[PDB]
Amino acid sequence: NATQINEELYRLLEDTEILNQEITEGLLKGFEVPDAVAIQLSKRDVVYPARILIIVLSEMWRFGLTKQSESFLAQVLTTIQKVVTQLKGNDLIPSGVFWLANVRELYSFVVFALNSILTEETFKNGMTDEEYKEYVSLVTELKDDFEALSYNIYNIWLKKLQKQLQKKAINAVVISESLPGFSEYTMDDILTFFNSIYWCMKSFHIENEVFHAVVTTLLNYVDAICFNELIMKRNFLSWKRGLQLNYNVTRLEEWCKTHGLTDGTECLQHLIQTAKLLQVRKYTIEDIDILRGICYSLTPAQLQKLISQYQVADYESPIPQEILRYVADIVKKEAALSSIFITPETGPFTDPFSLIKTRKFDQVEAYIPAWLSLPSTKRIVDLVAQQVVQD
Amino acid sequence: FKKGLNLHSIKVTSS
């Protein structure tokens, strides 16, 4: 009956011991990420929990079920953050991105809600100033809540990504050797990593500014840790190794250039300049001044360390003592005018999403994914459809 | 007197 829709629906939204169980344990914790090379996905196949949450929340606000919606959203926030926190392994990149979408979606909705409450005259005019004050306070608090959530999951995810990159890229970039015609992670693993991030953020309709931020952060991180690994290497810094490093770095730069990134070079600067230092001739004082010209991001002390641990090969002229003396004199000169290491950016970072104009919210169609095992939620949505038809 | 908050967020389309 149409006479008993909103009634039953009400009695469904009033029970936050059943609904909370299905939502937090079934929908959120029991989430399934869709398939992303070139695979096209409609926006409805990605942010389905966001859509469902938006439906339940909207219908709760319609019926004035305030405290219940507050508990609901509290447990939802806690659950989402917990889920992102427990992310590990091969699913780190897609799942993360997945949630980064959903949360963002939610945020937009709330913004819209607030922008409806304050702009549209009908709301401020149609109800008491006390109730209006309550709703404004509530919705605002929720907006800030989701802001904080997105910040949290972004920084958590990014920190995890860094924790894996530290485990792969050191050996891949510094130690791994693969040159054309000269004959346990490689550069291909790194490229596969960054490609995973790209295709995931692309197929899941994520704003490119976030991609820019993430990859820039990760690149700077790689640059830092690999440089801090290289400078303490000894019986290792040879011309061949400089060539190899230059090769790997060049691969990364190529990926950046062919995937939108313009500022990919400045991130890897220390490694580039390091390879250049290891490759160029360093036999004359002029060659050293040239080296200073090229390596602008490298400090004189770092130059001294790098040069002093260079490995001269067989049939290669060793670096003169006059040169080393000149280097020490330069370092002394710089001391007359704080460590040789680079401090890696571990976090926290500014949420890139908090710098982008929030997505304009459009009307969500009443739908719940058929493959889910959430009875109450499905009954809710099904009722909501008939409700909208009625209005 | 609570007017409630009916943000018409939800739509329905039939092919």
Side-chain angles (χ1 to χ4, degrees), chain A residues 77-112:
Chain A
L77 291 163
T78 289
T79 302
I80 288 180
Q81 176 146 354
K82 180 180 180 181
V83 164
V84 167
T85 286
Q86 285 171 337
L87 281 182
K88 54 175 155 291
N90 296 272
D91 299 326
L92 181 58
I93 306 191
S95 297
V97 171
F98 170 90
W99 284 115
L100 269 170
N102 276 272
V103 176
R104 179 57 173 186
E105 179 78 15
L106 284 170
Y107 183 78
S108 295
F109 169 74
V110 177
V111 166
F112 154 75

PDB file of all heavy atoms in Angstrom, chain A residues 77-112:
ATOM      1  N   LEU A  77      31.563   6.230  10.028  1.00  0.00           N
ATOM      2  CA  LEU A  77      32.886   6.854  10.018  1.00  0.00           C
ATOM      3  C   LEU A  77      33.939   5.936  10.621  1.00  0.00           C
ATOM      4  O   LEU A  77      34.979   5.661   9.997  1.00  0.00           O
ATOM      5  CB  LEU A  77      32.866   8.175  10.787  1.00  0.00           C
ATOM      6  CG  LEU A  77      32.082   9.341  10.187  1.00  0.00           C
ATOM      7  CD1 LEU A  77      31.819  10.394  11.251  1.00  0.00           C
ATOM      8  CD2 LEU A  77      32.830   9.948   9.012  1.00  0.00           C
ATOM      9  N   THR A  78      33.665   5.471  11.839  1.00  0.00           N
ATOM     10  CA  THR A  78      34.587   4.575  12.529  1.00  0.00           C
ATOM     11  C   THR A  78      34.899   3.348  11.678  1.00  0.00           C
ATOM     12  O   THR A  78      36.067   2.968  11.525  1.00  0.00           O
ATOM     13  CB  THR A  78      34.025   4.125  13.887  1.00  0.00           C
ATOM     14  OG1 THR A  78      34.054   5.228  14.798  1.00  0.00           O
ATOM     15  CG2 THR A  78      34.860   2.992  14.463  1.00  0.00           C
ATOM     16  N   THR A  79      33.858   2.754  11.101  1.00  0.00           N
ATOM     17  CA  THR A  79      34.018   1.557  10.283  1.00  0.00           C
ATOM     18  C   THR A  79      34.876   1.817   9.040  1.00  0.00           C
ATOM     19  O   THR A  79      35.790   1.046   8.750  1.00  0.00           O
ATOM     20  CB  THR A  79      32.654   0.988   9.852  1.00  0.00           C
ATOM     21  OG1 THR A  79      31.872   0.700  11.018  1.00  0.00           O
ATOM     22  CG2 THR A  79      32.832  -0.291   9.057  1.00  0.00           C
ATOM     23  N   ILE A  80      34.593   2.898   8.315  1.00  0.00           N
ATOM     24  CA  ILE A  80      35.354   3.222   7.108  1.00  0.00           C
ATOM     25  C   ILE A  80      36.831   3.427   7.432  1.00  0.00           C
ATOM     26  O   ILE A  80      37.709   2.820   6.801  1.00  0.00           O
ATOM     27  CB  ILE A  80      34.811   4.481   6.402  1.00  0.00           C
ATOM     28  CG1 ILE A  80      33.471   4.179   5.732  1.00  0.00           C
ATOM     29  CG2 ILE A  80      35.795   4.973   5.349  1.00  0.00           C
ATOM     30  CD1 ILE A  80      32.869   5.367   5.015  1.00  0.00           C
ATOM     31  N   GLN A  81      37.109   4.272   8.421  1.00  0.00           N
ATOM     32  CA  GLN A  81      38.495   4.514   8.812  1.00  0.00           C
ATOM     33  C   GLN A  81      39.194   3.216   9.226  1.00  0.00           C
ATOM     34  O   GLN A  81      40.352   2.990   8.870  1.00  0.00           O
ATOM     35  CB  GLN A  81      38.566   5.535   9.946  1.00  0.00           C
ATOM     36  CG  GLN A  81      39.975   5.755  10.474  1.00  0.00           C
ATOM     37  CD  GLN A  81      40.216   7.184  10.918  1.00  0.00           C
ATOM     38  OE1 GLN A  81      39.365   8.061  10.742  1.00  0.00           O
ATOM     39  NE2 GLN A  81      41.387   7.430  11.492  1.00  0.00           N
ATOM     40  N   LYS A  82      38.487   2.363   9.965  1.00  0.00           N
ATOM     41  CA  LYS A  82      39.049   1.086  10.403  1.00  0.00           C
ATOM     42  C   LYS A  82      39.384   0.192   9.211  1.00  0.00           C
ATOM     43  O   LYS A  82      40.433  -0.452   9.181  1.00  0.00           O
ATOM     44  CB  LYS A  82      38.081   0.360  11.342  1.00  0.00           C
ATOM     45  CG  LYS A  82      38.586  -0.988  11.858  1.00  0.00           C
ATOM     46  CD  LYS A  82      37.558  -1.645  12.778  1.00  0.00           C
ATOM     47  CE  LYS A  82      38.047  -2.986  13.312  1.00  0.00           C
ATOM     48  NZ  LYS A  82      37.031  -3.637  14.188  1.00  0.00           N
ATOM     49  N   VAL A  83      38.481   0.154   8.236  1.00  0.00           N
ATOM     50  CA  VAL A  83      38.660  -0.656   7.037  1.00  0.00           C
ATOM     51  C   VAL A  83      39.886  -0.209   6.250  1.00  0.00           C
ATOM     52  O   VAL A  83      40.728  -1.033   5.884  1.00  0.00           O
ATOM     53  CB  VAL A  83      37.412  -0.599   6.130  1.00  0.00           C
ATOM     54  CG1 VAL A  83      37.728  -1.111   4.740  1.00  0.00           C
ATOM     55  CG2 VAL A  83      36.275  -1.403   6.748  1.00  0.00           C
ATOM     56  N   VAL A  84      39.987   1.094   5.996  1.00  0.00           N
ATOM     57  CA  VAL A  84      41.159   1.636   5.311  1.00  0.00           C
ATOM     58  C   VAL A  84      42.436   1.324   6.095  1.00  0.00           C
ATOM     59  O   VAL A  84      43.468   1.000   5.511  1.00  0.00           O
ATOM     60  CB  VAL A  84      41.036   3.160   5.092  1.00  0.00           C
ATOM     61  CG1 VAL A  84      42.376   3.765   4.675  1.00  0.00           C
ATOM     62  CG2 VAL A  84      39.968   3.459   4.051  1.00  0.00           C
ATOM     63  N   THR A  85      42.354   1.398   7.420  1.00  0.00           N
ATOM     64  CA  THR A  85      43.502   1.118   8.280  1.00  0.00           C
ATOM     65  C   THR A  85      44.014  -0.318   8.136  1.00  0.00           C
ATOM     66  O   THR A  85      45.222  -0.559   8.136  1.00  0.00           O
ATOM     67  CB  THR A  85      43.157   1.390   9.758  1.00  0.00           C
ATOM     68  OG1 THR A  85      43.111   2.804   9.976  1.00  0.00           O
ATOM     69  CG2 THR A  85      44.205   0.792  10.687  1.00  0.00           C
ATOM     70  N   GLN A  86      43.095  -1.268   7.997  1.00  0.00           N
ATOM     71  CA  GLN A  86      43.472  -2.678   7.945  1.00  0.00           C
ATOM     72  C   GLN A  86      43.918  -3.129   6.554  1.00  0.00           C
ATOM     73  O   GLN A  86      44.256  -4.301   6.350  1.00  0.00           O
ATOM     74  CB  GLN A  86      42.311  -3.547   8.431  1.00  0.00           C
ATOM     75  CG  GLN A  86      42.124  -3.512   9.936  1.00  0.00           C
ATOM     76  CD  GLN A  86      40.853  -4.199  10.389  1.00  0.00           C
ATOM     77  OE1 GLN A  86      39.900  -4.334   9.624  1.00  0.00           O
ATOM     78  NE2 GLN A  86      40.834  -4.637  11.641  1.00  0.00           N
ATOM     79  N   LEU A  87      43.931  -2.196   5.605  1.00  0.00           N
ATOM     80  CA  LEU A  87      44.365  -2.488   4.240  1.00  0.00           C
ATOM     81  C   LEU A  87      45.842  -2.845   4.162  1.00  0.00           C
ATOM     82  O   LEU A  87      46.697  -2.098   4.637  1.00  0.00           O
ATOM     83  CB  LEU A  87      44.082  -1.297   3.324  1.00  0.00           C
ATOM     84  CG  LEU A  87      42.637  -1.151   2.861  1.00  0.00           C
ATOM     85  CD1 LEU A  87      42.498   0.027   1.913  1.00  0.00           C
ATOM     86  CD2 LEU A  87      42.188  -2.439   2.195  1.00  0.00           C
ATOM     87  N   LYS A  88      46.135  -3.987   3.552  1.00  0.00           N
ATOM     88  CA  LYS A  88      47.515  -4.414   3.357  1.00  0.00           C
ATOM     89  C   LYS A  88      47.626  -5.395   2.198  1.00  0.00           C
ATOM     90  O   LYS A  88      46.642  -6.024   1.804  1.00  0.00           O
ATOM     91  CB  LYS A  88      48.079  -5.043   4.636  1.00  0.00           C
ATOM     92  CG  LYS A  88      47.258  -6.187   5.208  1.00  0.00           C
ATOM     93  CD  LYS A  88      47.973  -6.824   6.396  1.00  0.00           C
ATOM     94  CE  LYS A  88      46.993  -7.507   7.345  1.00  0.00           C
ATOM     95  NZ  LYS A  88      46.124  -6.526   8.065  1.00  0.00           N
ATOM     96  N   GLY A  89      48.831  -5.513   1.649  1.00  0.00           N
ATOM     97  CA  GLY A  89      49.085  -6.461   0.582  1.00  0.00           C
ATOM     98  C   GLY A  89      48.715  -5.950  -0.798  1.00  0.00           C
ATOM     99  O   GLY A  89      48.637  -4.740  -1.026  1.00  0.00           O
ATOM    100  N   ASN A  90      48.468  -6.884  -1.712  1.00  0.00           N
ATOM    101  CA  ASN A  90      48.235  -6.568  -3.118  1.00  0.00           C
ATOM    102  C   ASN A  90      47.022  -5.679  -3.354  1.00  0.00           C
ATOM    103  O   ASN A  90      46.930  -5.006  -4.381  1.00  0.00           O
ATOM    104  CB  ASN A  90      48.091  -7.864  -3.924  1.00  0.00           C
ATOM    105  CG  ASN A  90      49.360  -8.689  -3.921  1.00  0.00           C
ATOM    106  OD1 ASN A  90      50.235  -8.500  -4.764  1.00  0.00           O
ATOM    107  ND2 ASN A  90      49.470  -9.606  -2.968  1.00  0.00           N
ATOM    108  N   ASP A  91      46.097  -5.675  -2.398  1.00  0.00           N
ATOM    109  CA  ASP A  91      44.873  -4.894  -2.520  1.00  0.00           C
ATOM    110  C   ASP A  91      45.051  -3.453  -2.043  1.00  0.00           C
ATOM    111  O   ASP A  91      44.107  -2.662  -2.098  1.00  0.00           O
ATOM    112  CB  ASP A  91      43.740  -5.557  -1.733  1.00  0.00           C
ATOM    113  CG  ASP A  91      43.422  -6.953  -2.229  1.00  0.00           C
ATOM    114  OD1 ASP A  91      43.538  -7.190  -3.450  1.00  0.00           O
ATOM    115  OD2 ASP A  91      43.057  -7.812  -1.397  1.00  0.00           O
ATOM    116  N   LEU A  92      46.255  -3.116  -1.579  1.00  0.00           N
ATOM    117  CA  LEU A  92      46.513  -1.796  -0.999  1.00  0.00           C
ATOM    118  C   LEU A  92      46.101  -0.644  -1.914  1.00  0.00           C
ATOM    119  O   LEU A  92      45.428   0.298  -1.484  1.00  0.00           O
ATOM    120  CB  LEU A  92      47.993  -1.650  -0.639  1.00  0.00           C
ATOM    121  CG  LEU A  92      48.375  -0.309  -0.008  1.00  0.00           C
ATOM    122  CD1 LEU A  92      47.563  -0.068   1.263  1.00  0.00           C
ATOM    123  CD2 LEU A  92      49.871  -0.230   0.281  1.00  0.00           C
ATOM    124  N   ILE A  93      46.500  -0.728  -3.178  1.00  0.00           N
ATOM    125  CA  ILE A  93      46.249   0.351  -4.128  1.00  0.00           C
ATOM    126  C   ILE A  93      44.779   0.450  -4.577  1.00  0.00           C
ATOM    127  O   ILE A  93      44.183   1.521  -4.456  1.00  0.00           O
ATOM    128  CB  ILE A  93      47.161   0.226  -5.373  1.00  0.00           C
ATOM    129  CG1 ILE A  93      48.628   0.145  -4.945  1.00  0.00           C
ATOM    130  CG2 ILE A  93      46.916   1.387  -6.323  1.00  0.00           C
ATOM    131  CD1 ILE A  93      49.601   0.278  -6.067  1.00  0.00           C
ATOM    132  N   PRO A  94      44.181  -0.650  -5.083  1.00  0.00           N
ATOM    133  CA  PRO A  94      42.802  -0.463  -5.551  1.00  0.00           C
ATOM    134  C   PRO A  94      41.824  -0.120  -4.419  1.00  0.00           C
ATOM    135  O   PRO A  94      41.207   0.950  -4.477  1.00  0.00           O
ATOM    136  CB  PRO A  94      42.461  -1.815  -6.192  1.00  0.00           C
ATOM    137  CG  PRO A  94      43.370  -2.783  -5.550  1.00  0.00           C
ATOM    138  CD  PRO A  94      44.637  -2.040  -5.267  1.00  0.00           C
ATOM    139  N   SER A  95      41.715  -0.990  -3.414  1.00  0.00           N
ATOM    140  CA  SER A  95      40.813  -0.778  -2.278  1.00  0.00           C
ATOM    141  C   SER A  95      40.896   0.645  -1.740  1.00  0.00           C
ATOM    142  O   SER A  95      39.885   1.343  -1.654  1.00  0.00           O
ATOM    143  CB  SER A  95      41.121  -1.763  -1.149  1.00  0.00           C
ATOM    144  OG  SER A  95      40.914  -3.104  -1.556  1.00  0.00           O
ATOM    145  N   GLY A  96      42.111   1.066  -1.396  1.00  0.00           N
ATOM    146  CA  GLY A  96      42.362   2.426  -0.961  1.00  0.00           C
ATOM    147  C   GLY A  96      41.677   3.437  -1.857  1.00  0.00           C
ATOM    148  O   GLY A  96      40.793   4.174  -1.399  1.00  0.00           O
ATOM    149  N   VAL A  97      42.046   3.436  -3.139  1.00  0.00           N
ATOM    150  CA  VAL A  97      41.474   4.367  -4.106  1.00  0.00           C
ATOM    151  C   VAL A  97      39.955   4.285  -4.056  1.00  0.00           C
ATOM    152  O   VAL A  97      39.276   5.314  -3.979  1.00  0.00           O
ATOM    153  CB  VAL A  97      41.972   4.088  -5.545  1.00  0.00           C
ATOM    154  CG1 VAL A  97      41.203   4.923  -6.559  1.00  0.00           C
ATOM    155  CG2 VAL A  97      43.466   4.372  -5.662  1.00  0.00           C
ATOM    156  N   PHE A  98      39.442   3.054  -4.041  1.00  0.00           N
ATOM    157  CA  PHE A  98      38.004   2.797  -3.972  1.00  0.00           C
ATOM    158  C   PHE A  98      37.382   3.620  -2.848  1.00  0.00           C
ATOM    159  O   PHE A  98      36.474   4.424  -3.086  1.00  0.00           O
ATOM    160  CB  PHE A  98      37.752   1.293  -3.784  1.00  0.00           C
ATOM    161  CG  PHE A  98      36.328   0.926  -3.467  1.00  0.00           C
ATOM    162  CD1 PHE A  98      35.425   0.649  -4.482  1.00  0.00           C
ATOM    163  CD2 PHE A  98      35.905   0.808  -2.152  1.00  0.00           C
ATOM    164  CE1 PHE A  98      34.124   0.289  -4.189  1.00  0.00           C
ATOM    165  CE2 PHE A  98      34.605   0.452  -1.857  1.00  0.00           C
ATOM    166  CZ  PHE A  98      33.714   0.194  -2.877  1.00  0.00           C
ATOM    167  N   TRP A  99      37.917   3.476  -1.639  1.00  0.00           N
ATOM    168  CA  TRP A  99      37.364   4.198  -0.503  1.00  0.00           C
ATOM    169  C   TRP A  99      37.539   5.700  -0.673  1.00  0.00           C
ATOM    170  O   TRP A  99      36.616   6.472  -0.394  1.00  0.00           O
ATOM    171  CB  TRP A  99      38.000   3.719   0.801  1.00  0.00           C
ATOM    172  CG  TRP A  99      37.442   2.401   1.220  1.00  0.00           C
ATOM    173  CD1 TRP A  99      38.110   1.216   1.313  1.00  0.00           C
ATOM    174  CD2 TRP A  99      36.079   2.123   1.567  1.00  0.00           C
ATOM    175  NE1 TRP A  99      37.251   0.218   1.711  1.00  0.00           N
ATOM    176  CE2 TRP A  99      35.997   0.749   1.873  1.00  0.00           C
ATOM    177  CE3 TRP A  99      34.919   2.903   1.656  1.00  0.00           C
ATOM    178  CZ2 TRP A  99      34.805   0.139   2.262  1.00  0.00           C
ATOM    179  CZ3 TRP A  99      33.738   2.297   2.041  1.00  0.00           C
ATOM    180  CH2 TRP A  99      33.689   0.928   2.340  1.00  0.00           C
ATOM    181  N   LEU A 100      38.701   6.106  -1.178  1.00  0.00           N
ATOM    182  CA  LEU A 100      38.974   7.519  -1.414  1.00  0.00           C
ATOM    183  C   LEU A 100      37.914   8.120  -2.327  1.00  0.00           C
ATOM    184  O   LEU A 100      37.641   9.319  -2.259  1.00  0.00           O
ATOM    185  CB  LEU A 100      40.367   7.716  -2.016  1.00  0.00           C
ATOM    186  CG  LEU A 100      41.509   7.928  -1.022  1.00  0.00           C
ATOM    187  CD1 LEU A 100      42.844   7.863  -1.737  1.00  0.00           C
ATOM    188  CD2 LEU A 100      41.358   9.260  -0.311  1.00  0.00           C
ATOM    189  N   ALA A 101      37.305   7.286  -3.168  1.00  0.00           N
ATOM    190  CA  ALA A 101      36.221   7.762  -4.011  1.00  0.00           C
ATOM    191  C   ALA A 101      34.979   7.945  -3.159  1.00  0.00           C
ATOM    192  O   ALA A 101      34.427   9.046  -3.075  1.00  0.00           O
ATOM    193  CB  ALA A 101      35.955   6.801  -5.150  1.00  0.00           C
ATOM    194  N   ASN A 102      34.574   6.862  -2.497  1.00  0.00           N
ATOM    195  CA  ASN A 102      33.322   6.824  -1.747  1.00  0.00           C
ATOM    196  C   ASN A 102      33.185   7.962  -0.749  1.00  0.00           C
ATOM    197  O   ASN A 102      32.234   8.747  -0.815  1.00  0.00           O
ATOM    198  CB  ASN A 102      33.189   5.488  -1.020  1.00  0.00           C
ATOM    199  CG  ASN A 102      32.614   4.407  -1.905  1.00  0.00           C
ATOM    200  OD1 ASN A 102      31.396   4.249  -1.993  1.00  0.00           O
ATOM    201  ND2 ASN A 102      33.485   3.667  -2.582  1.00  0.00           N
ATOM    202  N   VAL A 103      34.146   8.038   0.167  1.00  0.00           N
ATOM    203  CA  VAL A 103      34.216   9.119   1.134  1.00  0.00           C
ATOM    204  C   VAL A 103      34.012  10.457   0.437  1.00  0.00           C
ATOM    205  O   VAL A 103      33.136  11.236   0.830  1.00  0.00           O
ATOM    206  CB  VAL A 103      35.561   9.114   1.883  1.00  0.00           C
ATOM    207  CG1 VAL A 103      35.654  10.307   2.828  1.00  0.00           C
ATOM    208  CG2 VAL A 103      35.726   7.803   2.638  1.00  0.00           C
ATOM    209  N   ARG A 104      34.780  10.692  -0.629  1.00  0.00           N
ATOM    210  CA  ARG A 104      34.698  11.958  -1.354  1.00  0.00           C
ATOM    211  C   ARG A 104      33.264  12.213  -1.805  1.00  0.00           C
ATOM    212  O   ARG A 104      32.717  13.297  -1.579  1.00  0.00           O
ATOM    213  CB  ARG A 104      35.646  11.965  -2.554  1.00  0.00           C
ATOM    214  CG  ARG A 104      35.591  13.246  -3.380  1.00  0.00           C
ATOM    215  CD  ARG A 104      35.891  14.471  -2.536  1.00  0.00           C
ATOM    216  NE  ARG A 104      36.004  15.677  -3.353  1.00  0.00           N
ATOM    217  CZ  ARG A 104      36.373  16.865  -2.882  1.00  0.00           C
ATOM    218  NH1 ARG A 104      36.671  17.008  -1.595  1.00  0.00           N
ATOM    219  NH2 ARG A 104      36.449  17.908  -3.699  1.00  0.00           N
ATOM    220  N   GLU A 105      32.654  11.191  -2.402  1.00  0.00           N
ATOM    221  CA  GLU A 105      31.262  11.262  -2.830  1.00  0.00           C
ATOM    222  C   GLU A 105      30.395  11.740  -1.681  1.00  0.00           C
ATOM    223  O   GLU A 105      29.672  12.739  -1.809  1.00  0.00           O
ATOM    224  CB  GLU A 105      30.777   9.898  -3.326  1.00  0.00           C
ATOM    225  CG  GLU A 105      29.329   9.870  -3.775  1.00  0.00           C
ATOM    226  CD  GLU A 105      29.137  10.462  -5.154  1.00  0.00           C
ATOM    227  OE1 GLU A 105      30.143  10.630  -5.876  1.00  0.00           O
ATOM    228  OE2 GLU A 105      27.978  10.758  -5.516  1.00  0.00           O
ATOM    229  N   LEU A 106      30.508  11.041  -0.550  1.00  0.00           N
ATOM    230  CA  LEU A 106      29.754  11.385   0.646  1.00  0.00           C
ATOM    231  C   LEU A 106      29.917  12.864   0.946  1.00  0.00           C
ATOM    232  O   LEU A 106      28.922  13.585   1.091  1.00  0.00           O
ATOM    233  CB  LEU A 106      30.204  10.545   1.843  1.00  0.00           C
ATOM    234  CG  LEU A 106      29.725   9.092   1.865  1.00  0.00           C
ATOM    235  CD1 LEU A 106      30.431   8.297   2.956  1.00  0.00           C
ATOM    236  CD2 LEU A 106      28.214   9.040   2.058  1.00  0.00           C
ATOM    237  N   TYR A 107      31.172  13.316   0.976  1.00  0.00           N
ATOM    238  CA  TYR A 107      31.472  14.696   1.328  1.00  0.00           C
ATOM    239  C   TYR A 107      30.644  15.629   0.464  1.00  0.00           C
ATOM    240  O   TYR A 107      29.941  16.503   0.983  1.00  0.00           O
ATOM    241  CB  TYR A 107      32.963  14.996   1.172  1.00  0.00           C
ATOM    242  CG  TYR A 107      33.353  16.394   1.600  1.00  0.00           C
ATOM    243  CD1 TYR A 107      33.500  16.716   2.944  1.00  0.00           C
ATOM    244  CD2 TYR A 107      33.578  17.391   0.660  1.00  0.00           C
ATOM    245  CE1 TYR A 107      33.859  17.996   3.339  1.00  0.00           C
ATOM    246  CE2 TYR A 107      33.938  18.668   1.045  1.00  0.00           C
ATOM    247  CZ  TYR A 107      34.076  18.969   2.385  1.00  0.00           C
ATOM    248  OH  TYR A 107      34.432  20.244   2.768  1.00  0.00           O
ATOM    249  N   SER A 108      30.676  15.387  -0.848  1.00  0.00           N
ATOM    250  CA  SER A 108      29.977  16.244  -1.797  1.00  0.00           C
ATOM    251  C   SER A 108      28.521  16.380  -1.385  1.00  0.00           C
ATOM    252  O   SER A 108      28.015  17.499  -1.231  1.00  0.00           O
ATOM    253  CB  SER A 108      30.091  15.691  -3.218  1.00  0.00           C
ATOM    254  OG  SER A 108      31.440  15.716  -3.651  1.00  0.00           O
ATOM    255  N   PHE A 109      27.877  15.238  -1.145  1.00  0.00           N
ATOM    256  CA  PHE A 109      26.480  15.219  -0.737  1.00  0.00           C
ATOM    257  C   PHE A 109      26.249  16.156   0.436  1.00  0.00           C
ATOM    258  O   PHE A 109      25.391  17.046   0.374  1.00  0.00           O
ATOM    259  CB  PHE A 109      26.037  13.804  -0.363  1.00  0.00           C
ATOM    260  CG  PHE A 109      24.693  13.750   0.303  1.00  0.00           C
ATOM    261  CD1 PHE A 109      23.534  13.946  -0.428  1.00  0.00           C
ATOM    262  CD2 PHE A 109      24.588  13.501   1.662  1.00  0.00           C
ATOM    263  CE1 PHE A 109      22.297  13.898   0.182  1.00  0.00           C
ATOM    264  CE2 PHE A 109      23.353  13.451   2.277  1.00  0.00           C
ATOM    265  CZ  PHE A 109      22.205  13.650   1.536  1.00  0.00           C
ATOM    266  N   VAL A 110      27.047  15.982   1.486  1.00  0.00           N
ATOM    267  CA  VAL A 110      26.869  16.770   2.693  1.00  0.00           C
ATOM    268  C   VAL A 110      26.992  18.250   2.362  1.00  0.00           C
ATOM    269  O   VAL A 110      26.165  19.058   2.801  1.00  0.00           O
ATOM    270  CB  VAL A 110      27.879  16.384   3.784  1.00  0.00           C
ATOM    271  CG1 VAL A 110      27.707  17.280   4.992  1.00  0.00           C
ATOM    272  CG2 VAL A 110      27.691  14.927   4.175  1.00  0.00           C
ATOM    273  N   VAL A 111      27.992  18.591   1.549  1.00  0.00           N
ATOM    274  CA  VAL A 111      28.188  19.974   1.134  1.00  0.00           C
ATOM    275  C   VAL A 111      26.901  20.483   0.509  1.00  0.00           C
ATOM    276  O   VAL A 111      26.362  21.514   0.926  1.00  0.00           O
ATOM    277  CB  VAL A 111      29.353  20.122   0.140  1.00  0.00           C
ATOM    278  CG1 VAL A 111      29.314  21.490  -0.532  1.00  0.00           C
ATOM    279  CG2 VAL A 111      30.680  19.901   0.850  1.00  0.00           C
ATOM    280  N   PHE A 112      26.390  19.713  -0.451  1.00  0.00           N
ATOM    281  CA  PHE A 112      25.141  20.036  -1.124  1.00  0.00           C
ATOM    282  C   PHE A 112      24.054  20.289  -0.096  1.00  0.00           C
ATOM    283  O   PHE A 112      23.378  21.324  -0.143  1.00  0.00           O
ATOM    284  CB  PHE A 112      24.744  18.904  -2.077  1.00  0.00           C
ATOM    285  CG  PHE A 112      23.267  18.809  -2.337  1.00  0.00           C
ATOM    286  CD1 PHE A 112      22.633  19.716  -3.175  1.00  0.00           C
ATOM    287  CD2 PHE A 112      22.517  17.794  -1.761  1.00  0.00           C
ATOM    288  CE1 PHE A 112      21.272  19.622  -3.422  1.00  0.00           C
ATOM    289  CE2 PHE A 112      21.157  17.693  -2.003  1.00  0.00           C
ATOM    290  CZ  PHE A 112      20.534  18.608  -2.836  1.00  0.00           C
TER     291      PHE A 112
END
